[PDB]
């Protein structure tokens, strides 16, 4: 009875603060840090908030194929703030691309219209 | 076709974006005030959306045209703030994208949005 949001974010500080204003909004959420760990909990999620700068590679790369898997919306939330990023990100599958650093206020209304 | 209503009343940015968009393959219907807005909602598959026209903010009408149809809106105005951004996607944009911009982040977006 709570939407399930996928954090993949491998940064611990901002996860920690992230996770709590999440969970304090309600939200269910569920973190991995890697990308060989995306796979198992995706179905899981009603949201994936995906970073692309993870320790094993590029996740947008693998993000078709998680989309194949189920299609839920996805907000990329990386650092890569190039619009070439965004393109790539984007084209990938991605439903959004937020740039860090990024205003938690944002991302919470950003989460809302891909879910509503 | 996929149907793109434009709502700009800057004439040059629209002049030079509806090129490009009619280029890719869109069909493109153009408007320039709120109070042309409705008569073309229902023909379009997405709506750009500038904010600030002669005739008013468009995040107030919003939420009206939204129950007309739930079409897919991208918002594209220089109202840039965390408290405008937030207050255009609540009222029910579907994307919020910031002037100046990039036409190649426009076509990906709407891409998004589409598909």
């Not at 198992?40 to 590679?57: M, S």
């Amino acid at each position: 009875m709570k939407q399930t949001l996928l954090l993949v974010e491998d940064d611990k500080n901002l996860a920690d603060g992230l996770l709590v204003s999440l969970e304090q909004a309600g939200y269910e959420c569920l973190h991995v840090e890697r990308i060989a760990d995306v796979e198992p909990q995706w179905k899981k999620a009603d949201l994936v908030i995906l970073e692309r700068q993870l320790p094993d590679g590029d996740s947008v790369q693998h993000l078709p194929e998680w989309k194949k898997i189920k299609d839920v919306p996805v907000i990329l939330l990386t650092a890569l703030v190039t619009v070439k990023d965004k393109v790539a990100g984007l084209d990938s599958g991605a439903n959004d691309y937020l740039t860090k650093p990024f205003a938690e206020a944002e991302l919470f209304a950003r989460i809302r219209a891909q879910l509503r």
